[PDB]
Write an enzyme that holds these catalytic residues in place. Structure first.
Site, short mmCIF file in Angstrom:
data_model
loop_
_atom_site.label_atom_id
_atom_site.label_comp_id
_atom_site.label_asym_id
_atom_site.label_seq_id
_atom_site.Cartn_x
_atom_site.Cartn_y
_atom_site.Cartn_z
N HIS A 158 54.97 56.84 32.20
CA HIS A 158 55.86 57.83 32.86
C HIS A 158 55.74 57.78 34.37
O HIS A 158 56.70 58.18 35.03
CB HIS A 158 55.62 59.28 32.40
N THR A 167 54.16 69.55 35.52
CA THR A 167 55.61 69.23 35.44
C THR A 167 55.89 68.23 34.31
O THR A 167 57.07 67.87 34.18
CB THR A 167 56.21 68.73 36.75
N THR A 168 54.88 67.74 33.60
CA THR A 168 55.09 66.91 32.39
C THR A 168 54.34 67.60 31.27
O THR A 168 53.36 68.34 31.47
CB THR A 168 54.57 65.48 32.61
N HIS A 187 56.85 60.88 41.69
CA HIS A 187 58.11 61.03 40.95
C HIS A 187 59.25 60.51 41.84
O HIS A 187 59.19 60.80 43.04
CB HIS A 187 58.43 62.45 40.46
N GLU A 211 60.89 66.57 42.58
CA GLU A 211 60.82 67.63 41.56
C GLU A 211 61.08 68.99 42.21
O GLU A 211 62.05 69.66 41.84
CB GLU A 211 59.45 67.57 40.89
N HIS A 267 49.96 60.56 41.96
CA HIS A 267 51.10 59.81 41.42
C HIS A 267 52.35 60.30 42.12
O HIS A 267 52.30 61.23 42.93
CB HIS A 267 51.24 60.04 39.92
N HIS A 275 52.30 63.74 44.33
CA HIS A 275 51.43 64.79 43.78
C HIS A 275 49.97 64.31 43.82
O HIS A 275 49.60 63.36 43.10
CB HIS A 275 51.82 65.07 42.34
#
Ligand SMILES: CC1(C)O[C@H]2[C@H](O)CN(CCCCCCn3cc(CNC(=O)c4ccc(S(N)(=O)=O)cc4)nn3)C[C@@H]2O1
Ligand SMILES: [Zn+2]
Length: 258
Positions: free
Chosen positions: A62, A196-197, A94, A104, A92, A117
């Site tokens: 992901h 958020t996941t 996004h 996000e 990581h 993040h």
């Protein structure tokens, strides 16, 4: 039929396996800059990364995580809205398929090209798995990316991505200095939220910096050549791995700055 970012398994589906998806403190959110209140009782953030020990970079299907040694107080976040000491465990990103989306959090409904993040856990809970069961267990430092000039401190990450193209691949990633990913100003917004996941646990103090970092078009293009799939599986480009803004509900976003 595991969660992801496709039509069939994307954010709108997650609540069927993770009912907390419709909870009272979900992330990310839109930051309405006119509604956020300056809180003069907040402190300057303390970002202490000089003894950081990076170990490895992993494509987890992901995103990609850069992992750190968190077995002692080496890279820590303190101050601002936080009580006590939070240890850096991983960072990581996004990102989007195009520069107009990928973050996000949003700022007055503006989407940035990507969002970094930096994930930290509260040492009073002893380990990360115990910390994610607590309402004050994690602190995530969020940093927006815009496309413009290259970020020199990102290039060592960009250049290893070809070695972890597919899910489950990892590579040694020692001696990386995460101070090279910070903007000049530590002005921030802060609110209580979630992962958020999945599992979307409501354990995070969010600290989102106002000042974005600039990365080059060539740097973000390399993020978009990663794969969600494993080796020898149909190629699915790792793009649009972001959750959209969730309802703010009974929460106040506080600003560190006038
Ligand atoms: C395995 C290792 C080195 O990687 C760190 C990763 O953040 C997560 N590892 C797995 C934890 C095992 C059970 C704990 C509950 N949990 C955590 C996770 C993995 N997810 C997460 O840890 C997670 C972290 C940050 C964010 S965000 N986008 O910044 O909001 C979202 C998610 N899955 N279940 C613990 C890690 O230590
Ligand atoms: Zn994240």
């Amino acid at each position: 039929h595991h969660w992801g970012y496709g039509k069939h398994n994307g954010p709108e589906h997650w609540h069927k396996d993770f009912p907390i998806a419709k909870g009272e403190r979900q992330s990310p959110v839109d930051i309405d800059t006119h509604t956020a209140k300056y809180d003069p009782s907040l402190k300057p953030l303390s970002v202490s990364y000089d003894q950081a020990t990076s170990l490895r970079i992993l494509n987890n299907g992901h995103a990609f995580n850069v992992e750190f040694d968190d077995s002692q107080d080496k890279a820590v976040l303190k101050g601002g809205p936080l009580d006590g000491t939070y240890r850096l465990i991983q960072f990581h990103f996004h990102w989007g398929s195009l520069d107009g989306q990928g973050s996000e959090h949003t700022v007055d409904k503006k989407k940035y090209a990507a969002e970094l993040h930096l994930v930290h856990w509260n040492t009073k809970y002893g380990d990360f798995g115990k910390a994610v069961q607590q309402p004050d267990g994690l602190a995530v430092l969020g940093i927006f990316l815009k496309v413009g000039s290259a970020k020199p401190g990102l290039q060592k990450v960009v250049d290893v991505l070809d070695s972890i193209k597919t899910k489950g691949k990892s590579a040694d990633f020692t001696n990386f200095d995460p101070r090279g990913l910070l903007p000049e100003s530590l002005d921030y917004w802060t609110y209580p939220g979630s992962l958020t996941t999945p599992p979307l646990l409501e354990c995070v103090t969010w600290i989102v910096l106002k000042e974005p970092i600039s990365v080059s078009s060539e740097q973000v293009l390399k993020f978009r050549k990663l794969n969600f799939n494993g080796e020898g599986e149909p190629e699915e480009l790792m793009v649009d791995n972001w959750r959209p803004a969730q309802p703010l509900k009974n929460r106040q976003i506080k600003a560190s700055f006038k």
